[PDB]
Design an enzyme around this catalytic site. Structure first.
Site, short mmCIF file in Angstrom:
data_model
loop_
_atom_site.label_atom_id
_atom_site.label_comp_id
_atom_site.label_asym_id
_atom_site.label_seq_id
_atom_site.Cartn_x
_atom_site.Cartn_y
_atom_site.Cartn_z
N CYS A 127 0.83 -1.19 0.00
CA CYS A 127 0.00 0.00 0.00
C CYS A 127 0.87 1.25 0.00
O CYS A 127 1.09 1.86 1.05
CB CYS A 127 -0.86 0.01 1.27
SG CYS A 127 -2.28 1.13 1.19
N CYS A 187 -6.69 4.33 -6.86
CA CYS A 187 -6.33 5.05 -5.64
C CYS A 187 -6.47 6.55 -5.83
O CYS A 187 -6.15 7.10 -6.88
CB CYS A 187 -4.90 4.72 -5.19
SG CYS A 187 -4.46 5.44 -3.58
C1 FAD Z 1 -3.77 4.38 4.71
C2 FAD Z 1 -4.60 3.66 3.65
C3 FAD Z 1 -5.13 4.44 2.55
C4 FAD Z 1 -5.94 3.77 1.53
N1 FAD Z 1 -6.45 4.54 0.44
C5 FAD Z 1 -7.25 3.89 -0.58
C6 FAD Z 1 -7.82 4.64 -1.73
O1 FAD Z 1 -7.59 6.02 -1.89
N2 FAD Z 1 -8.61 3.96 -2.70
C7 FAD Z 1 -8.87 2.58 -2.57
O2 FAD Z 1 -9.73 1.91 -3.47
N3 FAD Z 1 -8.32 1.85 -1.45
C8 FAD Z 1 -7.51 2.55 -0.46
N4 FAD Z 1 -6.99 1.76 0.61
C9 FAD Z 1 -7.01 0.30 0.39
C10 FAD Z 1 -8.35 -0.33 0.81
O3 FAD Z 1 -9.30 -0.11 0.13
C11 FAD Z 1 -8.52 -0.35 2.35
O4 FAD Z 1 -7.39 -0.83 3.01
C12 FAD Z 1 -9.85 -0.97 2.86
O5 FAD Z 1 -10.27 -0.46 4.10
C13 FAD Z 1 -9.73 -2.51 2.89
O6 FAD Z 1 -10.98 -3.13 2.96
P1 FAD Z 1 -11.14 -4.50 3.89
O7 FAD Z 1 -12.76 -4.73 4.12
O8 FAD Z 1 -10.49 -5.64 3.14
O9 FAD Z 1 -10.25 -4.32 5.27
P2 FAD Z 1 -10.64 -3.17 6.39
O10 FAD Z 1 -11.23 -1.91 5.83
O11 FAD Z 1 -9.30 -2.91 7.32
O12 FAD Z 1 -11.85 -3.83 7.32
C14 FAD Z 1 -11.47 -4.92 8.13
C15 FAD Z 1 -12.30 -5.00 9.42
O13 FAD Z 1 -12.44 -6.32 10.06
C16 FAD Z 1 -11.92 -6.22 11.41
N5 FAD Z 1 -11.17 -7.25 12.14
C17 FAD Z 1 -9.86 -7.61 11.96
N6 FAD Z 1 -9.61 -8.76 12.73
C18 FAD Z 1 -10.82 -9.11 13.37
C19 FAD Z 1 -11.15 -10.17 14.25
N7 FAD Z 1 -10.14 -11.14 14.64
N8 FAD Z 1 -12.40 -10.27 14.71
C20 FAD Z 1 -13.38 -9.34 14.34
N9 FAD Z 1 -13.07 -8.29 13.48
C21 FAD Z 1 -11.79 -8.21 13.01
C22 FAD Z 1 -11.39 -4.81 11.60
O14 FAD Z 1 -11.21 -4.23 12.86
C23 FAD Z 1 -12.10 -4.00 10.57
O15 FAD Z 1 -13.25 -3.28 10.95
C24 FAD Z 1 -6.21 2.39 1.63
C25 FAD Z 1 -5.68 1.61 2.74
C26 FAD Z 1 -4.88 2.29 3.75
C27 FAD Z 1 -4.33 1.47 4.96
C1 LMT Z 2 -2.94 8.06 -6.08
C2 LMT Z 2 -1.82 7.72 -5.17
C3 LMT Z 2 -0.44 7.95 -5.67
C4 LMT Z 2 0.35 9.10 -5.08
C5 LMT Z 2 -0.32 10.14 -4.17
C6 LMT Z 2 0.55 11.30 -3.70
C7 LMT Z 2 1.63 11.79 -4.66
C8 LMT Z 2 1.94 13.29 -4.74
C9 LMT Z 2 1.88 13.93 -6.09
C10 LMT Z 2 2.98 14.92 -6.47
C11 LMT Z 2 2.74 15.83 -7.67
C12 LMT Z 2 3.19 17.28 -7.52
O1 LMT Z 2 3.51 18.00 -8.67
C13 LMT Z 2 2.54 18.43 -9.55
O2 LMT Z 2 2.40 17.46 -10.54
C14 LMT Z 2 1.77 17.88 -11.84
C15 LMT Z 2 2.50 17.16 -12.88
O3 LMT Z 2 1.80 16.22 -13.63
C16 LMT Z 2 1.82 19.33 -12.23
O4 LMT Z 2 0.58 19.67 -12.94
C17 LMT Z 2 0.74 19.57 -14.31
O5 LMT Z 2 -0.25 18.58 -14.87
C18 LMT Z 2 -1.56 18.97 -14.49
C19 LMT Z 2 -2.57 17.96 -14.88
O6 LMT Z 2 -2.34 16.66 -14.42
C20 LMT Z 2 -1.88 20.36 -15.00
O7 LMT Z 2 -3.12 20.79 -14.49
C21 LMT Z 2 -0.85 21.35 -14.57
O8 LMT Z 2 -1.15 22.62 -15.16
C22 LMT Z 2 0.50 20.90 -14.92
O9 LMT Z 2 1.51 21.81 -14.47
C23 LMT Z 2 2.05 20.24 -11.18
O10 LMT Z 2 2.65 21.44 -11.73
C24 LMT Z 2 2.97 19.74 -10.12
O11 LMT Z 2 3.02 20.70 -9.08
C1 DCQ Z 3 -12.30 0.72 -13.26
C2 DCQ Z 3 -13.23 1.34 -12.22
C3 DCQ Z 3 -12.74 2.56 -11.47
C4 DCQ Z 3 -13.68 3.21 -10.41
C5 DCQ Z 3 -13.20 4.57 -9.79
C6 DCQ Z 3 -14.11 5.74 -9.89
C7 DCQ Z 3 -14.79 6.22 -8.58
C8 DCQ Z 3 -14.41 5.51 -7.32
C9 DCQ Z 3 -13.00 5.80 -6.72
C10 DCQ Z 3 -12.24 4.63 -6.23
C11 DCQ Z 3 -12.36 4.30 -4.69
C12 DCQ Z 3 -13.13 3.20 -4.25
C13 DCQ Z 3 -13.83 2.33 -5.29
C14 DCQ Z 3 -13.24 2.91 -2.89
O1 DCQ Z 3 -13.98 1.86 -2.48
C15 DCQ Z 3 -12.60 3.71 -1.96
O2 DCQ Z 3 -12.71 3.43 -0.62
C16 DCQ Z 3 -11.85 2.50 0.03
C17 DCQ Z 3 -11.82 4.84 -2.42
O3 DCQ Z 3 -11.16 5.65 -1.53
C18 DCQ Z 3 -11.47 7.02 -1.48
C19 DCQ Z 3 -11.71 5.10 -3.77
O4 DCQ Z 3 -10.96 6.18 -4.22
S H2S Z 4 -1.45 2.56 -3.36
S H2S Z 5 -3.25 0.54 -0.56
S H2S Z 6 -4.14 3.80 -2.10
#
Ligand code: FAD
Ligand code: LMT
Ligand code: DCQ
Ligand code: H2S
Ligand code: H2S
Ligand code: H2S
Ligand code: FAD
Ligand code: LMT
Ligand code: DCQ
Ligand code: H2S
Ligand code: H2S
Ligand code: H2S
Ligand code: H2S
Ligand code: H2S
Lengths: 421, 421
Positions: B163, B359
């Site tokens: 992750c 993500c």
């Molecule tokens: C920091 C972070 C950022 C993330 N950002 C994104 C994102 O932007 N987009 C995306 O699509 N995904 C993201 N994820 C990935 C993902 O979607 C999540 O990790 C999500 O919450 C996982 O779903 P899950 O149901 O598998 O596990 P979880 O959400 O962790 O749910 C598991 C649950 O079961 C429980 N549990 C565990 N053990 C037991 C037990 N022995 N008995 C009873 N209950 C128990 C927990 O306490 C909990 O409530 C992120 C994950 C992390 C850690």
């Molecule tokens: C999803 C999870 C993965 C990673 C999450 C966190 C990562 C952090 C991201 C760092 C990016 C910062 O840097 C930023 O990037 C984009 C480059 O494409 C730039 O943006 C550039 O592309 C974008 C479109 O995508 C335009 O709107 C913008 O005019 C152009 O300059 C910014 O000028 C720069 O400031």
């Molecule tokens: C190919 C399909 C792509 C679907 C993405 C478009 C809209 C949804 C965003 C994705 C997302 C999901 C599904 C999601 O379940 C979740 O929660 C854990 C997010 O974190 C904010 C997400 O960003």
């Molecule tokens: S990720």
């Molecule tokens: S993740």
């Molecule tokens: S993520």
């Protein structure tokens, strides 16, 4: 006829071909569906830039329509409409024959408005066109003549253009082909001229980092680029360009010699459609409601480039937003649903949905693509992609679309999204 | 019981909460659905990095589960499972009570494997965690202590992590918050340590220009970055890092003092699930077929991070591919469909579909996001986005997901794609 409405589809292109199949599928044997088009063949329009550089041939992207629609029970007339009388509901064909309709669905696409720029017609001078396979072949022929006698190259998009992607694509693959032939250094100057306010505006205020990426791409290829330009005329093998500032004040005029050139023209509605009184705005685009129905004639519908879509922005040099494939298909789908509804009493409520733009461009080994929606910012999706996978996807989609045009579509068309399932 | 199967859902997280509602909706009043989870509240996991920097509070991202599932007819036990006996089909709870099941759906998510790196546990040293709201609060507390006594910062991802996004996100917003407080120049050194073979590999061999964009982002913030690293121990407030080359040969060892730190740990299966004989691979991930059914027990299903997914690549320092939201929901949907099928004779054929990763990361005013599918290249979709719109979308989706967790889902969940219609 009464109780057996005759439905005519005008134009067998990206919107029109699918519309004919879907209409026939939706209406069935009790109704007559007639497809009328200027050419007897279908062409895959997005492949024309490749034909213009010789990477593809007519045979790769075009095929005869008749057999494919007829085996579906669709009548096909390979004749251009010259006149539409919306009162009598009669269409006058090029050969003077007349065709009557109960519903008319207009999918005639763009008229290439070369007349906006005197001398710009591909038959009048060195500035060619890649919008149709006929033009792209002529473009390639002039490209070969350039190879024999190298001279300056000018590629770009006119004032009022709405289709910018292919100009960028074409400049890139011309540059690429020149290198391959070891002929790139024979070129005195390579210039890109656009009506866009900035590089990669694309008529949609940019998408993802289109600005940065297209700018760097043109620079990598040694292509000098000018924005906020309009071409006032082409004459004696020279392009007369006027450049303005933000306020439309002239900041310079240029005279560019052109040995080989290609400028995307502004699009208007075709004359037979524009000619219908009260049907169209001054551009010749059919004024329709959200159900694709003409606001003036309840039994005329329109889809594709032929319909009018209001601008959401105004640029220093006039430009328009593109009308692209997925939205066109949604338009088509809606029109067919609502016509069928009409035939069965109810009012169709189907709409084209959210405005969007999608475009794919293939540079050979790698492609670029974008998706933007809705029209105005901030968007819900605003993405630009680049890579070998985009190229593979273009290749795949083309193969799929052409096969579908031969096999027929039912159809909730875009279910090529089940690549998820 | 016979003719009235009792279905238990273990874990009330991203997969588990929706699974409870969907199960109950699919089965109806004739079957008992029980949800069991270690905590009595739901948390929106992707918002934890913001809690870790103090941009959000617990109250913004968490809420009590009981009332919401109970008004749907779902029984809720806020108790951790300590033992699962798959033979007798009994679950032993922390309080020693036992719960029987006819079908068990495991959605227990990750165990944070701090034990892989001695001293790395958030309670043992300066290296914190943002994966849960409890950890993210402790992370923020240590962040405030850093403000009082500035010192070196080390953020990143351990060997075996899967992750990576949130580590990048967290480094960026920490850097951003420091600037806002006028405290950034008080920081002696800011280092990013990752097991990735290169910046922005993200456990998925990169996506779009993630490499270029994350590299430049870290550099803009004055964050020095090291790849192909594993941490061997954390001791006396120092991180002992070993860096390898492509062939896993050590090319250097570093000792990094840490006043404030956050490393994403490697994920394993939770002990109660891993503890089930023959259920799991050595990592403690449930081995399932394409229908989400355990390969060993026909009445045990699993979804979410809890399931095992084979690696498609091998990196110099071990790393894994992430399991993200849309795929988790497809897993959940499939498991529910196939359990219901079982209850009604037929064999369910529903699968999770194509592997994908999605993500979203919010930096404050602007977000970054990606979509990759399928797992191996060349992909069908391989896109990285950045901008204010990504931020707006994160905000929107969070609000929507939380509301849905309170209102219940039927449901073919992701129809928030009708933003097209
Ligand atoms: C920091 C972070 C950022 C993330 N950002 C994104 C994102 O932007 N987009 C995306 O699509 N995904 C993201 N994820 C990935 C993902 O979607 C999540 O990790 C999500 O919450 C996982 O779903 P899950 O149901 O598998 O596990 P979880 O959400 O962790 O749910 C598991 C649950 O079961 C429980 N549990 C565990 N053990 C037991 C037990 N022995 N008995 C009873 N209950 C128990 C927990 O306490 C909990 O409530 C992120 C994950 C992390 C850690
Ligand atoms: C999803 C999870 C993965 C990673 C999450 C966190 C990562 C952090 C991201 C760092 C990016 C910062 O840097 C930023 O990037 C984009 C480059 O494409 C730039 O943006 C550039 O592309 C974008 C479109 O995508 C335009 O709107 C913008 O005019 C152009 O300059 C910014 O000028 C720069 O400031
Ligand atoms: C190919 C399909 C792509 C679907 C993405 C478009 C809209 C949804 C965003 C994705 C997302 C999901 C599904 C999601 O379940 C979740 O929660 C854990 C997010 O974190 C904010 C997400 O960003
Ligand atoms: S990720
Ligand atoms: S993740
Ligand atoms: S993520
Ligand atoms: C060079 C170029 C590249 C493009 N690339 C993309 C892309 O990558 N992705 C995307 O989604 N879109 C792309 N488009 C945009 C778009 O999708 C196409 O322009 C598409 O072909 C338009 O569909 P249409 O049915 O509205 O018009 P058309 O496809 O032009 O079909 C119109 C048809 O009706 C006919 N006709 C015109 N007048 C008459 C008459 N008086 N009587 C009878 N028939 C008549 C025509 O001859 C023709 O067959 C591109 C367009 C161009 C020009
Ligand atoms: C869709 C229609 C719109 C326009 C069509 C035609 C425009 C031509 C595109 C010119 C781009 C050329 O320049 C090319 O761009 C991308 C920058 O993002 C670079 O590629 C960069 O991002 C990609 C992913 O998107 C990574 O795989 C790559 O490793 C990275 O270097 C290439 O190193 C560069 O060579
Ligand atoms: C928001 C929906 C986006 C759909 C895009 C994914 C796959 C289809 C590519 C778009 C496309 C369409 C629809 C299309 O109709 C078309 O032909 C004119 C193309 O030219 C090659 C296209 O690239
Ligand atoms: S053109
Ligand atoms: S276009
Ligand atoms: S375009
Ligand atoms: S396009
Ligand atoms: S974490």
């Amino acid at each position: 006829m009464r109780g057996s409405a005759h439905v005519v589809i005008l134009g067998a292109g990206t919107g029109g071909m699918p519309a004919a199949y879907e209409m026939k599928e939706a209406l069935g044997s009790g109704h007559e569906v007639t497809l009328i088009s200027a050419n007897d063949y279908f062409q895959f329009v997005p492949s024309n830039p490749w034909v213009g550089v010789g990477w593809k041939e007519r045979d790769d992207i075009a095929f005869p329509i008749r057999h494919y629609v007829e085996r579906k029970g669709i009548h096909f007339i390979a004749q251009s409409a010259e006149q539409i009388d919306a009162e009598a509901q009669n269409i006058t064909l090029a050969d003077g024959n007349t065709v009557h309709y109960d519903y008319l669905m207009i999918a005639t696409g763009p008229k290439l408005a070369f007349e906006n720029v005197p001398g710009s017609d591909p038959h009048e001078g060195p500035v060619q066109s890649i919008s149709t396979v006929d033009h792209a072949e002529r473009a390639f022929a002039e490209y070969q003549a350039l190879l024999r006698e190298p001279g300056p190259i000018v590629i770009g998009a006119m004032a009022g253009a709405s289709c910018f992607g292919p100009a960028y694509e074409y400049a890139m693959i011309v540059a690429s082909d020149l290198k391959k032939r070891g002929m790139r250094d024979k070129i005195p100057s390579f210039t890109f001229i656009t009506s866009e306010p900035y590089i990669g505006h694309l008529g949609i205020q940019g998408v993802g980092d289109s600005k940065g990426i297209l700018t760097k791409g043109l620079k990598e290829e040694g292509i000098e680029a000018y924005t906020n330009c309009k071409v006032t005329k082409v004459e004696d093998n020279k392009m007369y360009v006027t450049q303005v500032d933000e306020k439309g004040e002239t900041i310079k005029e240029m005279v560019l010699p052109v040995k080989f050139g290609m400028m995307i023209p502004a699009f208007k509605g075709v004359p037979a459609v524009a000619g219908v009184e009260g049907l169209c705005n001054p551009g010749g685009f059919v004024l329709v409601d959200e159900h694709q129905r003409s606001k003036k004639y309840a039994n005329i519908f329109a889809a594709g480039i032929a319909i009018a879509i209001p601008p959401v922005e105004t640029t220093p040099v006039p430009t328009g937003a593109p009308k692209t494939g997925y939205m066109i298909e949604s338009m088509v789908s809606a029109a067919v649903h609502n016509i069928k509804a009409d035939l069965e009493g109810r009012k169709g409520e189907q709409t084209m949905g959210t405005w969007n733009a999608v475009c794919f461009a293939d540079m050979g080994d790698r492609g670029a693509a974008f998706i933007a929606l809705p029209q105005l910012k901030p968007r819900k999706v605003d993405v630009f992609a680049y890579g070998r996978w985009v190229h593979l996807a273009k290749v795949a989609f083309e193969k799929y679309f052409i096969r579908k045009m031969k096999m027929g579509v039912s159809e909730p068309f875009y279910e090529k999204v089940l690549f998820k399932m």
